Amino acid sequence: PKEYKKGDTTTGVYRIMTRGLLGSYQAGAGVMVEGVFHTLWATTKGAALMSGEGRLDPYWGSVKEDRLCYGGPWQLQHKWNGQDEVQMIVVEPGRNVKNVQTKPGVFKTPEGEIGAVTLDFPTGTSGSPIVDKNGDVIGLYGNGVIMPNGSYISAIVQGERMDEPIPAG
């Protein structure tokens, strides 16, 4: 019964699937970088994930910042430079993956400030990575918030790289 081991952590973009009553559906998306899976807290709320022949357990998270990672500390380090356009790697449930280019905006936080995108995709797309012109992940597609005209914008969810103690077996 060999689920005592770390699962597959191949670098890439992933769909997060789960079982419902009648079948399976996509709960969200995420990104695997440096052997660590990154997603929003809201997509799994900490549930363990099967990956290949093993498991990934939650490692660190922040409900407030809507960030969650598995298999090690938060590795994503790059941020939107505030000027350039970005590309979202859109992992919409039931759709082929596509890259969509967009100009983020700065939007008014009480607790500081945040970049947001005007792109409006279903909430099962949440946790899809957003990349810069180098393919560096600058954040994740956050859950949308409603504007005065009834349109939605979504935060670029991102925070600081966190430290890992030196591994030994």
């Binding site: 890439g12 973009v13 769909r15 997060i16 789960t18 998306a29 799994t44 449930p93 082929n96 990349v131």
Partner: protein
């Protein structure tokens, strides 16, 4: 467990998205005979 993950794309900026605003990704794997599997497909 309750939930699992499936690799569906590589991480990259795409030139073709830059030019038109939106591009479907072309992330392919090939079996022994040179036959394609489309990783990006939701049914793969």
């Amino acid at each position: 467990t309750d939930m699992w993950i499936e690799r569906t794309a590589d991480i990259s900026w795409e030139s073709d998205a830059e030019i038109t605003g939106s591009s479907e990704r072309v992330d392919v794997r090939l079996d022994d005979d040179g036959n394609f599997q489309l990783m990006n497909d939701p049914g793969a």
